[PDB]
Amino acid sequence: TFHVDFAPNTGEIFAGKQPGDVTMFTLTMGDTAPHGGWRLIPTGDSKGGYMISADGDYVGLYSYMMSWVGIDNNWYINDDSPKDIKDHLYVKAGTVLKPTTYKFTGRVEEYVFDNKQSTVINSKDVSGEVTVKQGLEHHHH
Numbered sequence: 001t002f003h004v005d006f007a008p009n010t011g012e013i014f015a016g017k018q019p020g021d022v023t024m025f026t027l028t029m030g031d032t033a034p035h036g037g038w039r040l041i042p043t044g045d046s047k048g049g050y051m052i053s054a055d056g057d058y059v060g061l062y063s064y065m066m067s068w069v070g071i072d073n074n075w076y077i078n079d080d081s082p083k084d085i086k087d088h089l090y091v092k093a094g095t096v097l098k099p100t101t102y103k104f105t106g107r108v109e110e111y112v113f114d115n116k117q118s119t120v121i122n123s124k125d126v127s128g129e130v131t132v133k134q135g136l137e138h139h140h141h
């Protein structure tokens, strides 16, 4: 019953200084069965909550619905509802993007609370790449 859908967004991302907050990825997750909440752990090179250019540049991602705990290295939201959670990760206006591909890896865990603690009852590794286009080339001689 545990389902996860992590996907990059489609088309129209332009290299340069973003004029607004821009979704890079979207995440949909849900469960009818009893649960405590959800985290997304940014894994590997995404550790710290980042996207990674094949070149090696890191870009900071934010979560619209979840909160970030640096110490634990995850985004979480506590939710018990059997309703679908629709989050996405985005970069903040003013972020400079480069006309390249950016990877994101991490792991999505569902959890439970029995009294004092959380345990992982379900998990899914997730990844995604997002390709940023150049607009017009600009040639100055």
Ligand SMILES: OC[C@H]1O[C@@H](O)[C@H](O)[C@@H](O)[C@H]1O
Pocket (backbone or CB within 6 Å): 037, 039, 069, 072, 074, 076, 078, 118
């Ligand atoms: O509210 C439960 C959450 O508590 C935070 O401290 C933790 O980093 C998350 O991973 C999740 O356990």
